[PDB]
Design a protein around this ligand. Structure first.
Ligand SMILES: Nc1ncnc2c1ncn2[C@@H]1O[C@H](COP(=O)(O)OP(=O)(O)O)[C@@H](O)[C@H]1O
Ligand SMILES: Nc1ncnc2c1ncn2[C@@H]1O[C@H](COP(=O)(O)OP(=O)(O)O)[C@@H](O)[C@H]1O
Ligand SMILES: CC(C)(COP(=O)(O)O)[C@@H](O)C(=O)NCCC(=O)O
Ligand SMILES: CC(C)(COP(=O)(O)O)[C@@H](O)C(=O)NCCC(=O)O
Ligand SMILES: [Mg+2]
Ligand SMILES: [Mg+2]
Lengths: 355, 355
């Protein structure tokens, strides 16, 4: 029985797979052909079908788990293609699946079309916390799982640097997926969802597809990297002529996101790249402001950002870093994690002894 | 010297004008022709040029102010047309102007092209608080200035009803203009800006103009009233197949605003009206969530929404009413005000004895 953990989100399916590497001569000879066939397919390919990708760089090598040495693999595909994944799962050639995310419920009846399959569902928040605390405790092949941006307010000094979660309590976890959930973790047993926002990575991608015609998340990020968001955004200085110093708003801060788009003349001169950047900046800053308000409210100064909205997205990471640093006068730290999108999948996999 | 108060915003200029009605026979005969000419122009017209409007329905009749009986008029035009207002102010025919808003600073040098004019600038937040507490204390021609939506969670029962601010402390004031400023008013002397958000009425109008081609705020509201925002928004049930009951998210709540727009097929079947509604719903709910988080943080259960984003906008008012009521289990009251956009202009006018 292959060891999988699956987090089925609104947008992406995330899959963690533990490949045993201590396979004895007897076990290897007595391996079922279809089980041996899955292991070879998963480790001999980095693209699966037309939409599955294995994030080779995230692999945890020579991990001990359930008393076996093996490697932890990380795989992702769009939730839209889960039916293809399932139809191939029913391939005549071919087992316990721990699943979390909204789609463990939505697609429960579909998984049970695989006759030799028992589906155990696990709570999304439970799996996220367990997964995060586990990955950080085994480290990233000896490197820190958790990093931050030192001197996030100074550009010529800003650089990524490791961060130590040896005691990670208390902790605010901001999960930026399709939407946004915010968790307060006080201990490994005491955590709660304190709020969320529907203005998440789906909002960026949805709005940006509407405004610019971009076809992918990556194309949107690369358009955004070429844009100037101040072309679409009305700034404090467009209203004051300078700074609003009585309340500490500098002239370059955004007063109204997309506020310059109320003028036909400005809508006509704005580029898709500007709009892509304005969308990203607007979604990111609003998340950072909500996160800041929860942190102050929960009296928690470490805020960890996870989820896939930040994959290959350094612009948002820096925006979040700079924003928490600036508005909090340094008392709030934005924290990031190499395995950002996969913690639910890992936490699900860790629920395997419970069945 | 005419008595004006002017709040020059990022989008709209708001003007309060006190028309004296106790004009004695001597004063009337000895009135300067150009001062008599301004009074007749302002009270004999409801549209001024092509963009000025007098909100006749908001007039405060037979008010006593600075020891004179008169009427309080409320006028608005786009900040874009302030230069026209000023060039006509320099008309050879023709005096102290108290001004607030970012534009009192931005256009300070322009006002001084009017030779017989002394410009005194006043702080925006100061004027807002003074104006609000003053209008509510003189009432709306005997009716309550402040109202709310009783049973905001039940549709067949939801109705506007008066609300009493005889003691209005503490108070959270959420000013939804181009952007959003949030004030905590603990007393008439002790108030502070506690946060804000750049996702304000300019964001709704800017995004909606981009997405739908609407030419005006009113056209956007009327498009929104015909739309179905769930066509653009991904809901909890699109992800879970139903409710996320472990954390009390019903299946109809928005999981990801505009989240369904990541699918080419859905972008192709969505209508401008749907997009108009999704924009309004997304901006409004995010403001209501931020407001809820400040209220809980400031330990204040009365939240007053002002600014012009809500003029002729009952959909947003109800969304804000329902949202504060629902998420707070009834302990938070959304409050609204007949004179929503004009409190800064009134507060400025009240600074007149100080000069
Ligand atoms: N390859 C990708 N395909 C689609 N969306 C991506 C991709 N990479 C990053 N994203 C972003 O991640 C977000 C979803 O992150 P994720 O945490 O997996 O969400 P969910 O749990 O809702 O599926 C998307 O909204 C998008 O902004
Ligand atoms: N006639 C209108 N023209 C333009 N915007 C309007 C109008 N009526 C309502 N609005 C909305 O009010 C918002 C501005 O409100 P207001 O409080 O006057 O802002 P500001 O102080 O920044 O000028 C606009 O963003 C728009 O959403
Ligand atoms: C409902 C969700 C937990 C779904 O999880 P996801 O697929 O985004 O990982 C998340 O989208 C969310 O919390 N959205 C915010 C909804 C709200 O709090 O109003
Ligand atoms: C800067 C402003 C006070 C300008 O006032 P306005 O013209 O919107 O009435 C307001 O747009 C605002 O507070 N925006 C939010 C900016 C922020 O807090 O990040
Ligand atoms: Mg998720
Ligand atoms: Mg204003």
């Amino acid at each position: 029985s292959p060891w999988f953990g699956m987090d089925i989100g609104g947008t992406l399916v995330k899959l963690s797979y533990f490949e045993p590497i201590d396979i004895t001569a007897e076990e290897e000879q007595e391996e079922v052909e279809s089980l041996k066939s899955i292991r070879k397919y998963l480790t001999s390919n980095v693209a699966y079908g037309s939409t599955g990708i294995r994030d080779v760089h995230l692999e945890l090598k020579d991990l001990t788990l359930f008393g076996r040495r093996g490697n932890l693999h990380f795989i992702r595909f769009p939730t839209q293609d889960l039916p293809t994944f399932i139809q191939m799962g029913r391939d005549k050639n071919f087992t316990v699946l721990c699943a979390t995310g909204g789609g463990a419920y939505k697609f429960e009846k579909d998984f049970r079309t695989i006759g030799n399959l028992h589906l155990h569902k696990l709570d999304e928040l439970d799996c996220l916390v367990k997964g995060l605390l586990y990955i950080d405790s085994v480290s990233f092949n000896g490197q820190a799982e958790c990093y931050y941006f030192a001197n996030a307010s100074e550009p010529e000094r800003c650089q990524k640097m490791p961060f130590n979660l040896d005691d990670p309590y208390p902790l605010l976890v901001v999960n930026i997926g399709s939407g946004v959930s915010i968790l307060a973790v006080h201990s490994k047993d005491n955590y709660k969802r304190v709020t969320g926002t529907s203005l998440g990575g789906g909002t960026f991608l949805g709005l940006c597809s509407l405004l610019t015609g971009c076809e992918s998340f990556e194309e949107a990020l690369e358009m955004a990297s070429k844009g100037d968001s101040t072309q679409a955004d009305k700034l404090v200085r467009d209203i004051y002529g300078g700074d609003y110093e009585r309340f500490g708003l500098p002239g370059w801060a955004v007063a109204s996101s997309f506020g310059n788009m109320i003028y036909k003349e400005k809508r006509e001169s704005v580029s898709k790249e500007d709009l892509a950047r304005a969308t990203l900046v607007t979604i990111t800053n609003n998340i950072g402001s909500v996160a800041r308000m929860c942190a102050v409210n929960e009296k928690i100064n470490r805020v960890v950002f996870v989820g896939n909205f930040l994959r290959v997205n350094t612009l948002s990471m820096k925006l979040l870093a700079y924003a928490l640093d600036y508005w909090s006068k340094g008392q709030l730290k934005a924290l990031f994690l190499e395995h950002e999108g996969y913690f639910g999948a890992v936490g699900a996999l860790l629920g395997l002894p419970n069945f």
